[PDB]
Symmetry: C6
């Protein structure tokens, strides 16, 4: 990555490389893997971002969908920021293309130059955005269960049902508005008869704390 | 986080990310997880605090109650510190809102600016307070056992009973006044007949050391 | 803790937090846990000392006896160093109370101010002393076996007997004078008949090396 | 390696040495091992590159093919950059040969001199290129399965088939053009009858996301 | 310990504390534990040396013999370097006693003062010498087998016999002169008849390499 | 070791000490242990080199052959660089002897003085050379199998045979000339009849890549 002490390139650490590989091995495309990807790639160059994706041995269908997302974003970058086709000014910073941000057509030195310019051209953060957009599509793709089939079992603790409910909603990537809203509708409709009766009785404007307390 | 050598942003470490994920995996919302959360989030930006919460794959009912606690606190921040609605002074520090402290509407650069201002606007510590208040509600919620059902078994060592007693009291979050007070009342009432007889005999003003020595 | 490079606050490390939690999990209140507590808390602020104690999930009877020891010491600090009750001199160092040393009524900034004053008011070391005094009472409390029941088995190697003997004496916290003295008395009385005969024959002023060599 | 704080030699870390040995033990010449080799050898001298290859205990047929690749590249370096045969200018930088880049005929000091010259003679990066070219030949060699035998099982989830497909294609080292192209041909021909029918129906210009969604 | 960047006190690391505890748990007083003790205590203060010994939970007979060795050495230090009994010169370095070197009567600050004086009074290294002398007595004590009972089995590879032989000799702490000398005498006498015949035939002045090659 | 930030002594790390001990425990005198020894001893003083060898608990026949190799090299150093026998010039650098390089007769301070002189007297690297020469003799000694008994099994994959072949050749320490030469002779003679027929047909000047491809 690029770190302080002034802004300089540092080798990606064995600890970082290993954490990323292990999390994918243990968690595949469970949603929590995305924020972990983001955090492990703090200060990453495009090269570092390619390194972490390349070190993954499985999930090559995901990696191939991911490349499709990156080309779409690359093409929209190029549509928005076309670069003049002439030869570059001797010893001057060339403008980055989509493929330069994705690190397919840029060197580490070019990447350093952009990310440490004043002001920075933050190619690391631009590419991380493309990748995370791509990873989110995959999370949703690999979400195995519709929220509509998350229903509380006759003998299932309400807390365990809410855990499954909100885990499913996270993979299906319903926004926060739909997370706080489902609280007074689908969460209750999908509750078992006993709890549903208690939750109906509470009235509307019940916090999730109040609902969860109410169903024991 | 933000650390010295002057005050600068540092990437959250793989060691830190992994410790937090593991403690939640092993301990869920056992009370000792909260002080561990606090310590692992030493110097954290709002972004870092969101990162540690986001990296958690389970407990999504807790994470959703947590968001409710954060909105209540956000709203009370906004009620107490309203921000002028105008466009910002070029290159000047804007005042943070509830949502800026919770890191939903603030950038890392804004967060750095606040936390490294002279004097600091300590948005990291303000948000950690909201989160810990939220986590404590959850600890109490997930405390499975009333102190009233913690009673010493006929053949249970007094020390093991006191361990269960004070573990339960910690999850139920009785204050220190009620921890030092329960010593001369509920701890004795909940003791087995043999030990209760010994503890009655000691008289009042017996230290817990004295009680525990007295019951072998 | 507080460390050099000048004296500055540093976050307690994940490695430190984890070592302390694990040692308590593996060793409970075996005496060797105390010197390990001391070493893991090198340079600790009162806050850090509370952090390490708070991160412990079990042993809440011990943690509650510990608080009793800390209040006694707090009260003796207050008896010895009363603080004037007036409002503080603007931007000046207030004097610490018992509760400020125990970190219940002091901020991290106050704690830093004291421990980095010239000369230091070493609140970290004052509190570590209180805690270790408290932990030693607990070690002795949780010592399961009187030295008087440590007797060499008919077929037990003398070395294994001496190991049990001096382990017991450590938990029971006999001073060094009583450790070097027990050598020519209780160690011999508690030996098996065969070894006792050999040890009687050696005469007095036999080193433990000489005794252990003598009993094969 | 060579790192900043100015450009200086640093010992290869135990963490780095161990990561490389373990990845080869776990993954042999699975393609993801190459980008991991590249990342673990960030800032490496030729000596460091020889160190990581030498620390490998198995795969000596691979290590011997690797040496053949390195001699071919060494010979092409020498063909392109012949060095004058005279004795060197006292205290001056000699020009590197193939064998000097491969670290068989160069000292660490010479390697440091080249890699830290202004501008650098980047012998570390030149040698890493030779080695990675050699490692890629081996990956392809050790790829056990033709893409032509990757066909979706009657009851095999389309996602699992695509994973095998694109894993195989990676080991066989088909370029990106042939990865994005196989999408509308061999991936579909190799699908099971049910999915093939669905994929035929989609028409051409279907994204892999669209195909994978379409086959459930 | 005391380290450079000028000479300053550093906290003993969790990694160091844990390595020492584990090596004693795994290896007890096998001779290789002593050089490991020495290396783990690089730059140690007397306090650090007491910390590593105190963190050991077993082997309290050894720890008690160790204290006897330390008092003997302390007494010989005092016999050789008596200290004037007067009160100290305000703000001046007092001379260390045996008990000050063993860290029983000295503070960390005093220890720092001595070890960082110009020239250093190297109390860390003086105490490490006493301790290692004490640990060596214990290694020999706990050596279970006389070299005289190390004899090659009828079917035991000569290499395995030599391994047992020289392991035993190390615990029994025969000097290097007696290690290189035993080569042409006891090693051969203790060999099995077949190998003994081969070794007799070699003649004297045979290297251990030559002997080991000769016996297959 | 000795490291930069100017050239200064650093404690050998717990990580380094542990890596070396573990590699010997897992790999004994498999050839790959030597380059790992070299890499773990980067910047080592003679003292550090003795520390790593001393920390090894087994293989005392090897350690004793090793000492014989070190004395031979010590004696050749003394034959080549005799030292004047007079008393040293006050506060001046004495010349090192064989035994000073092997760290038996030199202090750490003397070792630092030599290795940090301008120019350096590189006693660390001189001793590492002696040791590695000694370790290589042992690797060959402990190589269990002649290359002549490495023959491809009727049903053994050619790749697995070549792996055994070149592993054996590495332990037997045939030079690179004999590794690249054995390719067109012994590798083919030792192949099974089927593969031998294919390899004979290829003709001479076949790469190992070509041979391995040819035998499936
Ligand atoms: O090296 C790389 C480059 N890219 C970007 C890319 C984008 C589109 C097409 C090819 C490559 C990548 C994307 C995803 C996984 C791994 C990688 N590995
Ligand atoms: O990213 C985030 C932001 N917040 C604050 C928030 C507060 C209220 C509503 C939405 C978000 C959060 C809170 C809890 C767990 C995870 C997260 N993750
Ligand atoms: O936060 C804390 C504060 N104290 C001191 C205290 C002293 C007396 C009464 C309450 C608190 C403490 C003591 C022991 C274990 C954990 C803690 N945790
Ligand atoms: O030491 C080395 C040197 N080389 C380069 C070399 C190149 C060609 C011939 C001999 C040596 C090497 C290559 C591959 C694996 C290990 C090593 N180990
Ligand atoms: O704290 C200590 C002090 N000493 C030196 C000592 C020397 C003689 C008598 C008492 C103490 C010690 C020696 C050995 C193991 C542990 C320790 N722990
Ligand atoms: O301390 C040491 C010194 N030497 C050199 C030596 C050389 C020859 C004779 C005695 C000692 C050594 C050599 C090999 C293993 C361990 C060690 N340990």
């Amino acid at each position: 990555p690029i770190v302080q002490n002034q802004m300089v390139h540092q080798c990606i650490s064995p600890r970082t490389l290993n954490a990323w590989v292990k999390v994918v091995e243990e968690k595949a495309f469970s949603p929590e893997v995305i924020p972990m990807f983001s955090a492990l790639s703090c200060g990453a160059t495009p090269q570092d971002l390619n390194t972490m994706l390349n070190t993954v041995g499985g999930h090559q269908a995901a990696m191939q969908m991911l490349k499709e997302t990156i080309n779409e974003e690359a093409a929209e970058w190029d549509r928005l920021h076309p670069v003049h086709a002439g030869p570059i000014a001797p010893g001057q910073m060339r403008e980055p293309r989509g493929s330069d941000i994705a690190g397919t057509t840029s060197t580490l030195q070019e990447q350093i130059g952009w990310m440490t310019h004043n002001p920075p051209i933050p190619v690391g953060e631009i590419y991380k955005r493309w990748i995370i957009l791509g990873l989110n599509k995959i999370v949703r793709m690999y979400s195995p269960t519709s929220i509509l089939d998350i229903r509380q079992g006759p003998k299932e603790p309400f807390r365990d049902y809410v855990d499954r409910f909100y885990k499913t909603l996270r993979a299906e990537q319903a926004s926060q508005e739909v997370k706080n809203a489902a609280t007074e509708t689908l969460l209750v409709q999908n509750a078992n008869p006993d709890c549903k009766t208690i939750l109906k009785a509470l009235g509307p404007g019940a916090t999730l704390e109040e609902m969860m307390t109410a169903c024991q």
